[PDB]
């Protein structure tokens, strides 16, 4: 069944599972034409496929060439997502293949189910959670590799950096979702918080700054405050 | 014209023959149905006055034998049987007609309804969906489940309709996942018509038989099958022109004949609204769309 608040700890058990987010696969800018009509220009996108237990992010970059000459792109984008996820699963050793794939948007369910007919034992699940994975393109190094790609490409990252050396997967996922919720609600403020102190750097092989345990608690507090406020400034409370 | 005699009517029962029905009282002097049109299959069906649970009945074709009905007090139902002694059968029938103890199959001469509902239905194909090879007639009731239903428990008593499943490897060619799921023409024309049914007439016959079992017995798996076979055509971009025209006639007469008070359970909102207004064939079912809108605008 669907994933929700009540069965949240299943994400961190020892059954392999992947979240798939398709919200950044088909990305466009809308502009005016010389004749004063409106047109879209696509930009590079990505599939966000994440193991919440390990931090493994399979970032499949979607180059604009994949849309050339195609119609109904928003619809194609869900099927292209499902094709690429199915191809990823097939490329993995049997003991690394997921036992469940959780899609962040229900419109992915049928495209993924059809592409995975060869894997009847892999459960395809929706979720009731409003997960903030769309904000992954607010992570500078992830945005940078997507925009620079000149061809289809898969890039591998641990989205948790080295956090699992010190914290549990449950706590790592809570931190990640808090960071991404903040980046989605107010990107500028969230990024100001993360970088304000120049003495805290981001390692070349990491995505986030090298905060101490104490500094993470402060950071996490600041991101919470932001999310309440922006909910203020938004709902006037 | 053919006759199905009744040994007797020991229990109060509503008897149907095709789309006609009549009430018979406990131990009323009823000895059968005469003037049944030759050239069509028929169904004779029963609903006991006590237990409205279980409508049941028999599909038969009078060209394939002499059939009669006899109540069994141990199993508690009216059973169809074959009489092999042809002289014994004419004598029984002629006596019962002489004593005028039979109802006449009450067809109006202008009326093509039954032909229109059973145009492609063949007794030989019914006997493959309903497996009971020692009889020339086929028993169906409200509770029988379909093969596909049993996959998601007695196989001998199942309705072996052709399994249709839009999210299955049979329906979906590797590497044509999106194409085949959004346009089911491959599945309809190659897998089902060419591969399984051989021709559109056998496809339509199964579709019409599923509708009739849904209507006469409230058989739920039959209703699922009827709707699946409609949706497979309507969701195909490429359908022979003759099939679409005939489908429009088939459905028209099915919707025309459905009891109005049963449309709430026998008609699937999603399939009909998709078929009539969203699918590739949304503009190809003019007669069916007109009767649906005038008779069940609520559903839509
Ligand atoms: N998505 C995914 C799948 C497998 C392993 C990893 C970890 N990986 C990321 C950085 C590389 O420099 C090597 C280590 C990530």
UniProtKB/Swiss-Prot annotation, chain A:
Changing residue 22 to N: Reduced growth at 30 degrees Celsius. Strongly reduced growth at 16 degrees Celsius. Residues 7-237 are annotated as: RNase H homology domain. It comes from the Eukaryota. It comes from Saccharomyces cerevisiae (strain ATCC 204508 / S288c) (Baker's yeast). Functions as a scaffold that mediates the ordered assembly of spliceosomal proteins and snRNAs. Required for association of BRR2 with the spliceosomal U5 snRNP, and the subsequent assembly of the U4/U6-U5 tri-snRNP complex. Functions as a scaffold that positions spliceosomal U2, U5 and U6 snRNAs at splice sites on pre-mRNA substrates, so that splicing can occur. Interacts with both the 5' and the 3' splice site, as well as the branch region. Has a role in branch site-3' splice site selection. Associates with the branch site-3' splice 3'-exon region. Also has a role in cell cycle. Component of the U4/U6-U5 tri-snRNP complex composed of the U4, U6 and U5 snRNAs and at least PRP3, PRP4, PRP6, PRP8, PRP18, PRP31, PRP38, SNU13, SNU23, SNU66, SNU114, SPP381, SMB1, SMD1, SMD2, SMD3, SMX2, SMX3, LSM2, LSM3, LSM4, LSM5, LSM6, LSM7, LSM8, BRR2 and DIB1. The MPN (JAB/Mov34) domain has structural similarity with deubiquitinating enzymes, but lacks the residues that would bind the catalytic metal ion. Contains a region with structural similarity to reverse transcriptase, presenting the classical thumb, fingers and palm architecture, but lacks enzyme activity, since the essential metal-binding residues are not conserved. This is Pre-mRNA-splicing factor 8. It is found in: Nucleus. Present with 468 molecules/cell in log phase SD medium.
Curated annotation (Swiss-Prot), chain B:
It comes from Saccharomyces cerevisiae (strain ATCC 204508 / S288c) (Baker's yeast). Keywords: Cytoplasm, mRNA processing, mRNA splicing, Nucleus, Phosphoprotein. It comes from the Eukaryota. Disulfide bonds: none annotated. Phosphorylated on serine and tyrosine residues. This is A1 cistron-splicing factor AAR2. GO terms for biological process: spliceosomal snRNP assembly; spliceosomal tri-snRNP complex assembly. The keyword Membrane does not apply. InterPro entries: AAR2, AAR2_C, AAR2_C_sf, Aar2_N, AAR2_N_sf. Heterodimer. Interacts with PRP8 (via RNase H homology domain and MPN domain), competing with BRR2 for the same binding site. Component of a U5 snRNP complex that contains at least the U5 snRNA, PRP8, SNU114, AAR2, SMB1, SMD1, SMD2, SMD3, SME1, SMX2 and SMX3, but is not a component of the U4/U6-U5 tri-snRNP complex. One of its GO terms (cellular component) is U5 snRNP. Residues 244-265 are annotated as: Leucine-zipper. The keyword Cytoplasm applies. The modification Phosphoserine is found at residue 236.
């Amino acid at each position: 069944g669907a994933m929700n608040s009540s069965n949240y700890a299943e994400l961190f058990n020892n059954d392999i599972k992947l979240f798939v987010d398709d919200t950044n696969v088909y990305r466009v800018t809308v502009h005016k034409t010389f004749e004063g009509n409106v047109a879209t220009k696509a930009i590079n996108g990505c599939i966000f496929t994440l193991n919440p237990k390990t931090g493994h992010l399979f970032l499949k970059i979607i180059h604009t060439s994949v849309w050339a000459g195609q119609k109904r792109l928003s619809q194609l984008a869900k099927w292209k997502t499902a094709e690429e996820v199915s191809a990823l699963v097939r490329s993995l050793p049997k003991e690394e293949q997921p036992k469940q794939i959780i899609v962040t948007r229900k419109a992915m369910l049928d495209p993924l189910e059809v592409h995975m007919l060869d894997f009847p034992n892999i459960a395809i699940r929706p979720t009731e959670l409003r997960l903030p994975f769309s904000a992954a393109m607010s992570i500078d190094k992830l945005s940078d590799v997507v925009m620079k790609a000149t061809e289809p490409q898969m890039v591998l990252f641990n989205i948790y950096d080295d956090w699992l050396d010190r914290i549990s997967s449950y706590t790592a996922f809570s931190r990640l979702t808090l960071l991404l919720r903040a980046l989605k609600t107010n990107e500028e403020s969230a990024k100001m918080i993360l970088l304000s102190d120049p003495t805290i750097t981001i390692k070349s092989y990491h995505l986030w700054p090298s905060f101490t345990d104490e500094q993470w608690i402060t950071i996490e507090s600041q991101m919470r405050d932001l999310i309440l406020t922006e909910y203020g400034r938004k709902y006037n409370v | 014209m053919n006759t199905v005699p009744f040994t007797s009517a020991p229990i109060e029962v509503t008897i149907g023959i095709d789309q006609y029905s009549f009430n018979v009282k406990e131990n009323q002097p009823f000895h059968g149905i005469k003037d049944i049109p030759i050239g069509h299959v028929h169904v004779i069906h029963f609903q006991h006055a006590d237990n409205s649970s279980m409508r049941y009945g028999y599909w038969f074709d009078c060209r394939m034998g002499n059939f009669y009905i006899q109540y069994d007090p141990k199993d508690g139902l009216y059973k169809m049987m074959e009489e092999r002694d042809g002289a014994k059968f004419e004598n029984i029938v002629h006596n019962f007609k002489e004593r005028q103890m039979m109802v006449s199959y009450p067809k109006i001469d202008e009326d093509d309804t039954w032909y229109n509902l059973t145009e492609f239905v063949q007794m030989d194909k019914i006997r493959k969906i309903v497996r009971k090879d020692e009889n020339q007639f086929s028993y169906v009731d409200s509770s029988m489940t379909t093969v596909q239903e049993n996959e998601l428990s007695d196989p001998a008593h199942s309705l072996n309709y052709t399994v249709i499943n839009f999210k299955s490897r049979e329906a979906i060619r590797p590497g044509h996942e999106m194409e085949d799921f959004l346009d089911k023409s491959y599945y309809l024309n190659t897998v089902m018509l060419q591969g399984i049914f051989k021709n559109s007439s056998n496809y339509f016959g199964e579709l019409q038989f599923a509708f009739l079992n849904a209507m006469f017995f409230g058989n739920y798996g039959s209703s699922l099958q009827w709707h699946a076979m409609i949706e497979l055509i309507c969701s195909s971009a490429t359908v022979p022109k003759h099939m679409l025209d005939k489908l429009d006639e088939i459905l028209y007469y099915q919707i025309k004949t459905l009891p109005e008070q049963y449309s709430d359970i026998l008609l699937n909102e999603r399939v009909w609204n998709i078929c009539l207004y969203s699918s590739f064939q949304k503009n190809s079912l003019h007669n069916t769309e007109k009767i649906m809108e005038n008779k069940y605008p609520e559903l839509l």
